[PDB]
Nucleic acid binder design. Structure first.
Ligand SMILES: [Mg+2]
Ligand SMILES: [Zn+2]
Ligand SMILES: [Zn+2]
Lengths: 107, 97, 171, 168, 51, 229, 519, 58, 84
RNA sequence: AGCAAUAGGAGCUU
DNA sequence: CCAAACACAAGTGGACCGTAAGCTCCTATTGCTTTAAAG
DNA sequence: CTTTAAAGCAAACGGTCCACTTGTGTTTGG
């Protein structure tokens, strides 16, 4: 994780994905001042494991492309270090049922 | 004349879940037609002689794999206009992938 | 030549026939319908292996008509000729312009120009037949004859052979 | 109407000259693919039946359907009768008499023996059980494809075949 | 006649003779050719100067 | 998982009030003589006092009620609102049960506490929005009916059932069976065109309608705008 | 059952596969080559074969049959011809994509400007969607201005090394600017040269840009032979009992034929290069406006009445076009309309139907052994008395009109036959007021036959319809089968819509005098 | 919307339409996989074979 | 292949409104086509009402095949689904 | 046993 | 370690497509004019 | 000298998309 101050120029940015097998993510300090997962409108995201993702797909008789989706650049996917194909589980308030579990897959 | 069963009437029938009634309004109460398609090329280029019981798609040189379809006459006319603009709509009666 | 062929036949059943021994009625309908028919894509359907034990499955009611559709899948035996394949036969007819030989369900006729020239026809022999010195073609004979043509007519097909080639003709 | 596992065969832009039949050159048509399928879509080897297996199968099916018609209670000219329709009876009678006029293997025992011995392309496999041949010449000239395979064995296989061939 | 498009329509109308007052009103009618292509509700409004 | 014609506004009784009011409505004590069931309502009144193998079940019930109170107050309805649209109307069920079985004359009730507790527990484990032995199926099923279970447990509490509604065993079994069947009737049917119904349900009110509101604001929302008025 | 027997099995469309039509298949499916412009022979009775009214194209007359299929007007679909063009022309609906492919590919050797060597394109190839893949390859490959012969020892990728032009669009003419090395010589790209360049694209190259080998080949976006639609798509009409004008498409095809022949009068004699371009461009413009007469920045193909030509695109779009005017909604039989009235004495799910409408509309009731007496009474009653019947349908489709039949007493009803009896009490009919804003604006009612030609409604159902009785009219739709009767009565019936899902409250109440009176 | 442009793009890219939607089944006059058309109705044999033997096909 | 075994059937055990409507329509059409009637016909002649009587007595011989979004399906005879 | 099309204009009920 | 020219990134101007539903009536127009050929 | 048929000829404001302009960064090579 490479926390920077002002800007990461696109020329420098291109080296980020070409450094396999390591992973480099960057955040700007201004963005990190508030932790957004503590916000009341942001429910708790929990990345699933591979076995649990397989269980989720089989329980619903689903393909990966038939799930609601989340961008890798989503602030909470960025905050969680989500890689492509990983599924978060989002438990949230429900005024009709009390509790509701949502799942989104990463683009 | 007849009364128009417009788009919002179709929306209301869809909300009601009455699929058979919608199909019956749009087909048997209106321009229902019968066409023959080629089982190979899926174009309505089948030459049919019903009294001699003989069929042929001359492009595909086919005389055995030919199917009939009941479709709105407006749908047949739409496909023929698309063919007139070089677009080929191919109606296939079975899924492959 | 005979091939074992998996084939199907979609059918339509009236609601009036919806009784307790329906499936056997459809089995009898299949047996009457298919035992004898020709199709240009398969050949000739002589019999059906295990006829009484075909599975009709569950039929679907067509919306708007009320008649049932069945995909009665089964494995049968079909007989189809191919050009350039050798097929045995027995002669049926005789004529100055050639003779007819029954092949499988069909009857094959060979023309005069496609016959070894040592064979000579005779309208006056008792019995009337083609002859030669050391070759004979009379009624009841066997003929190992090649097929060199097959036109596909939907109901009845016909194959025209040629006995002009070596190892062929009277046997 | 009459259809089978052969389904779409959809139209690619290009055609193929290799579509005409020539039984001398292993070209049979797009209905007898080198790997068949069954009624469950599962893969299955092509079937090319000799006269013996087919005769046994047809006799078996006819007598099974007769016992089924009878509630559970000998000759082709009679055994072909099980069908429905005069044309049906005629075609099956002609086919059965053709089978009994050229059936060198007149039993299940020798059919099983040749099945074991033979199991190579099923076409020629069945044609060897169908076409009696004295030596290598008849096979390699009437069936011109045995040349370019370099596994012939026709000599001894044909010897044992004509040995197992019953009298007539 | 050959420029029917780009020409004003409905400038002449069949005189309404259903009743007498309908005729008297039709003879005193007015039309602003703004057109219905446009949802500006301002020119449709009764205005003070209309008094 | 419910069809939108089948739900009616109902009060969730564990949400409102002070802790003292909550305690007085719902908490029972077996050893304590005064704060127990009023003796003049049940047949088995004298057998109740002093027991322990039943005060355990009463404490489990009260702790489940406190769990529901905390859940609804802190997660679901943080602002205190307790009147929400929900499936089967239980006031009407209770009043119908009173009418059919003639709950007058304040008769000695033959409805034991353990039978009440186990009846409500079984009912809470009988409301099927999703069927299947899978584990995500079980989790989704329990998340689906959490609010409705909160309602059913806030209403069918032991003190309330025995004192305020005075149901006997027959009325109790009838209320439970009716809750099963009417909840099974409140479910949406597979095949519903909920998208067309929702589109019409949203569009029709628009025909009757310095913060921007009404039709221009709805147009801004649906025509997702990078800038708004 | 109103279709004559055909031996093919009837099935329904599960998959639609769009795509272009190749010239080979266009020639193949045709039935007659079209070359003579003039409509009639010489104004001479069964016009010139090889013209736009060749009987091979099909029949549009009631007492004449199709010379191609031998079927009546009812069954003959119409048959396509073809009309070879002297020069190839652009398909008007594909010029932008022709431009984008021209920008992407090497215009000399038919190869992609960049390979899988460059990892950006090596990953842009990896998109499954044809459109996203095409966009991701075009947005990178459009800027390299050469077909490099070496992939970035000397290893050759097979490229050529010719520079790339800056493509631009001015109307229907594709300009390509070659900036040599100063003066960039800008030349016109004709449809034929682009067609030749496009034929050279290899199958795998074709796959990378997102096209298809079997269905959509990039050169089939250039027209070289034109299909001629049957006269069904462009039928003539009769104005005053003896006169006929051809449809717009027919005159447009005639103009195209004139243009084609004028093109074939220039490459046969003197043509000083300022007539070849003019006439070929006339052909291009006629072909373009035959398909799309709404092209920006040019005049429209006009009629001698001053109106523009009704192009096919204009045929297909809009509220009144094919899709929304004939497919999403259409006019239907077995419907009625009249003013509505209120009736305090009707039940909630009852509608009062005028006698005249009850006799004009009909329901087909299959004859069975539980309703044969009643149906024979209806047959005897006739189509002028209620309850009667209008038609008897025999088991093969033959209609027995009971008006002109003088011997109505001598009809015995067979089993399985069908009688199209009158509208009767308790028949479920769909009843509807526009606009139909929600599912409760169109509901199924039980019929009660009444005099006095208005429709009668119980007054509590006027709220879901938003109706009142000061001029309103409402529509009535009669279901023509038992499946639709059951669907109406079990899903759309008035009692079933009392509670709405919009706000989980009732929509029908007590109104408008019963409320005041009950207070 | 954009009917002609969308159809041209579908032609130029060889789109395959799976015919699972509502409008698509509407324009072809077929039963939509919707409401009453979201299932199929088969013929049950186990219940049928209980009928009296005289109600049979002849 | 796509059929589901009668033990792992995870759909509702209750006949839905659409299934009931279509089943009644189809049965009515069948009886109106001179199909045999399983119930005892006492008074009524309308095929739809006869179909309703048969449906209530669980004597309608039809099967609902409930397609899942992935193409698989479950089979339920009408007599084993519960009708309200 | 067979009753044109396209336009414009004025209106009806929301 | 620093100079530089061209590889590489956005900001910006100005193209198209669409605008409730259903219904009724009446009225007008459906190519016209000029030149050439044949009787 | 007149009539019929065929061919030719006129003068409303918003927003997604596409790449040319404006601008910043690299990293060879001294
Ligand atoms: Mg009104
Ligand atoms: Zn074809
Ligand atoms: Zn090149």
């Amino acid at each position: 994780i490479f926390i920077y101050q002002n800007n990461i120029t696109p020329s420098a940015n291109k080296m980020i994905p070409t450094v396999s097998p390591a992973i480099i993510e960057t955040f700007q300090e201004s963005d990190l001042v508030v932790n957004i997962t503590h916000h009341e409108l942001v429910p708790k995201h929990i990345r699933l494991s591979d076995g649990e993702k397989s269980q989720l797909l089989q329980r619903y008789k689903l393909k990966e492309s038939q799930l609601p989706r989340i961008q890798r650049e989503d602030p909470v996917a960025r905050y969680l270090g989500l890689k492509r194909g990983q599924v978060v589980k989002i438990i949230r308030r429900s005024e009709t049922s009390g509790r509701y579990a949502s799942y989104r897959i990463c683009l | 004349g007849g009364l128009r069963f417009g788009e919002m009437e179709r929306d209301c029938m869809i909300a009601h879940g009455a699929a058979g009634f919608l199909k019956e309004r749009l087909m048997e109460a209106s321009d229902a037609f019968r066409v023959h398609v080629c089982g190979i090329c899926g174009l309505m280029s089948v030459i049919a002689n019903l009294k001699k019981n003989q069929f042929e798609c001359r492009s595909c040189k086919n005389k055995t794999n030919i199917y009939q379809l009941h479709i709105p006459y407006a749908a047949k006319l739409l496909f023929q206009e698309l063919m007139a603009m070089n677009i080929a709509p191919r109606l296939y009666t079975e899924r492959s992938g | 030549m005979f091939f074992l062929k998996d084939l199907s036949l979609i059918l339509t059943l009236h609601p009036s026939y919806f009784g307790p021994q329906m499936n056997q009625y459809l089995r009898e309908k299949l047996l009457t319908d298919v035992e004898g028919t020709c199709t240009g894509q398969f050949g000739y359907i002589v019999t059906v292996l295990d006829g009484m034990n075909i599975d009709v499955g569950k039929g679907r009611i067509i919306p708007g008509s009320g008649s049932a559709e069945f995909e009665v899948k089964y494995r049968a035996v079909v007989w189809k000729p191919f050009k350039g394949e050798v097929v045995d036969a027995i002669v049926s007819n005789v004529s100055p312009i050639g003779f007819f030989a029954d092949v499988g369900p069909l009857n094959v006729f060979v023309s005069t120009r496609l016959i070894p020239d040592n064979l000579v026809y005779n309208p006056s022999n008792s019995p009337p037949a083609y002859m030669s010195n050391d070759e004979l073609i009379t009624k009841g004979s066997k003929v190992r004859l090649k097929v060199v043509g097959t036109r596909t007519d939907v109901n009845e097909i016909y194959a025209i052979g040629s006995i002009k080639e070596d190892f062929l003709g009277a046997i | 109407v009459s259809t089978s596992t052969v389904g779409a065969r959809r139209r690619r832009a290009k055609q193929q000259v290799d579509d005409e039949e020539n039984a001398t050159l292993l070209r049979l048509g797009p209905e007898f693919a080198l790997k068949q399928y069954d009624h469950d879509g599962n893969e299955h080897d092509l079937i090319a039946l000799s006269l013996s297996e087919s005769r046994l199968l047809i006799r078996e099916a006819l007598k099974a359907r007769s016992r089924a018609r009878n509630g559970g209670v000998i000759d082709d000219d009679e055994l072909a009768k099980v069908t429905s329709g005069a044309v049906a009876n005629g075609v099956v009678k002609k086919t059965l008499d053709y089978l009994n006029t050229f059936a060198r293997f007149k039993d299940e025992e020798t059919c099983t023996a040749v099945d074991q011995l033979l199991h190579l392309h099923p076409f020629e496999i069945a044609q060897l059980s169908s076409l009696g041949c004295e030596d290598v010449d008849e096979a390699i000239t009437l069936i011109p494809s045995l040349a370019a395979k370099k596994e012939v064995n026709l000599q001894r296989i044909l010897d044992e075949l004509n040995r197992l061939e019953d009298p007539y | 006649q050959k420029k029917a498009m780009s020409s004003r329509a409905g400038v002449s109308q069949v005189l309404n003779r259903y009743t007498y007052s309908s005729t008297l009103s039709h003879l005193r009618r007015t039309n602003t050719p703004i057109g219905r292509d446009g949802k500006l509700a301002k020119p449709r409004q009764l205005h003070n100067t209309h008094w | 998982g419910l069809d939108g014609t089948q739900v009616e506004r109902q009060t969730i009784d564990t949400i409102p009030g002070s802790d003292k009011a909550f305690h007085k409505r719902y908490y029972v004590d077996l050893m304590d003589e005064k704060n127990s069931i009023k003796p003049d309502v049940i047949e088995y009144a004298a057998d109740i006092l002093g027991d322990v193998e039943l005060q355990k079940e009463l404490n489990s019930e009260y702790e489940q009620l406190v769990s529901d109170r905390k859940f609804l107050r802190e997660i679901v309805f943080v602002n205190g609102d307790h009147n929400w649209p929900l499936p089967v109307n239980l006031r009407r069920i209770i009043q119908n049960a009173q009418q059919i079985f003639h709950l007058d004359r304040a008769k000695a009730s033959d409805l034991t506490i353990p039978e009440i507790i186990h009846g409500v527990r079984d009912l809470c484990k009988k409301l099927f929005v999703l069927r299947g032995e899978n584990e995500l199926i079980k989790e989704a099923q329990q998340n689906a009916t959490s609010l409705f279970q909160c309602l059913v447990r806030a209403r069918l509490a032991t003190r309330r059932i025995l004192e305020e509604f005075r149901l006997n065993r027959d009325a109790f079994e009838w209320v439970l069976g009716t809750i099963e069947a009417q909840f099974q009737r409140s479910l949406v049917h597979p095949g519903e065109m909920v998208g067309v119904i929702a589109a019409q349900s949203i569009g029709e009110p628009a025909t009757q309608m310095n913060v921007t509101l009404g039709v221009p604001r709805l147009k801004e929302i649906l025509n997702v705008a990078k800038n708004i008025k | 059952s109103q279709f004559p027997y055909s031996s093919a099995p009837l099935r329904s469309v599960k998959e639609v596969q769009f795509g272009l039509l190749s010239p080979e298949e266009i020639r193949a499916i045709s039935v007659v080559k079209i070359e003579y412009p003039e409509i009639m022979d010489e104004s001479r009775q069964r016009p010139r074969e090889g013209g736009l009214n060749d009987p091979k194209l099909g029949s549009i007359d009631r007492n004449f049959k199709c010379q191609t299929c031998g079927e009546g007007m009812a069954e003959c679909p119409g048959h396509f011809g073809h009309m070879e063009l002297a020069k190839p022309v652009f398909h008007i609906g594909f010029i932008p994509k022709i431009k984008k492919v021209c920008e992407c590919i090497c215009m000399n050797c038919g190869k992609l400007l960049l390979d899988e060597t460059n990892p950006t394109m090596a990953q842009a190839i990896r998109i499954r969607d044809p459109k996203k893949r095409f966009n991701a390859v075009w947005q990178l490959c459009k800027t390299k201005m050469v077909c490099e012969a070496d992939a970035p020892k000397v290893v050759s990728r097979g490229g050529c090394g010719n520079t790339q032009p800056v493509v631009r669009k001015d109307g229907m003419k594709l300009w390509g600017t070659w900036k040599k090395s100063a003066q960039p010589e800008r030349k016109l790209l004709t449809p034929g040269e682009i067609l030749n360049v496009f034929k050279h694209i290899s199958p795998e190259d074709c796959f990378r840009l997102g096209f298809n080998e079997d269905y959509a080949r990039p050169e089939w976006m250039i027209i070289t032979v034109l299909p001629v639609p049957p006269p069904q798509v462009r039928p003539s009409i009769a104005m005053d009992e003896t006169t006929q004008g051809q449809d717009d498409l027919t005159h447009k095809l005639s103009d195209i034929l004139k243009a084609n022949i004028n093109v074939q009068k220039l490459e046969m004699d003197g043509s000083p290069q300022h007539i070849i371009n003019e006439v070929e461009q006339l052909l291009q413009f006629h072909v373009a406006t035959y398909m799309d007469n709404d092209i920006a920045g040019q005049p429209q193909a006009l009629q001698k009445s001053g109106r523009p030509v009704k192009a096919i695109r204009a045929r297909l779009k809009g509220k009144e076009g094919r899709l929304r005017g004939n497919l999403m909604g259409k006019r239907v039989d077995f419907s009625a309309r009249t003013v509505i009235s209120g009736d305090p004495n009707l039940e909630l799910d009852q509608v009062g139907v005028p006698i005249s409408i009850a006799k004009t509309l009909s329901y087909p009731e299959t004859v069975t052994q539980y309703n044969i007496h009643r149906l024979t009474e209806y047959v005897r009653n006739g189509p002028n008395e209620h309850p009667g019947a209008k038609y008897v349908i025999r088991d093969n489709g033959d209609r027995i009109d009971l008006r002109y039949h003088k011997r109505a007493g001598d009809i015995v009803l067979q089993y399985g036959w069908k009688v199209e009896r009158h509208l009767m009490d308790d028949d479920p009919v769909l009843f509807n007021r526009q606009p139909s804003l929600h599912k409760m604006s169109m509901m199924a009612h039980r019929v009660k036959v009444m005099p006095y030609s208005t429709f009668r409604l119980n007054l509590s159902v006027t709220s879901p319809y938003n109706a009142d009785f000061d001029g309103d009219e409402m529509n009535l739709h009669v279901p023509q089968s038992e499946e639709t009767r059951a669907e109406l009565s079990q899903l759309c019936a008035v009692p079933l819509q009392i509670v709405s899902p919009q706000s989980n409250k009732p929509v029908m109440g007590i109104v408008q005098d019963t409320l005041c009176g009950v207070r | 919307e954009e009917t002609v442009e969308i159809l041209f793009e579908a032609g130029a890219a060889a789109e395959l339409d799976d015919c699972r939607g509502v409008s698509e089944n509407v324009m072809l006059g077929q039963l939509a996989p919707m409401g009453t058309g979201a299932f199929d109705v088969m013929i049950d044999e186990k219940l049928l074979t209980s009928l009296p033997a005289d109600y049979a096909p002849t | 292949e796509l059929a589901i075994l009668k033990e792992e059937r995870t759909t509702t055990p209750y006949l839905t409104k659409y299934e009931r409507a279509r089943i009644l329509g189809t049965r009515a059409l069948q009886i109106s086509m001179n199909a045999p009637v399983l119930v005892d016909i006492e008074g009524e002649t309308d095929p739809l009402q006869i179909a309703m009587k048969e449906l209530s007595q669980r004597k309608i011989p039809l099967v609902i095949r409930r397609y899942l979004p992935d193409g698989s399906y479950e089979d339920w005879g009408c007599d084993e689904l519960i009708v309200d």
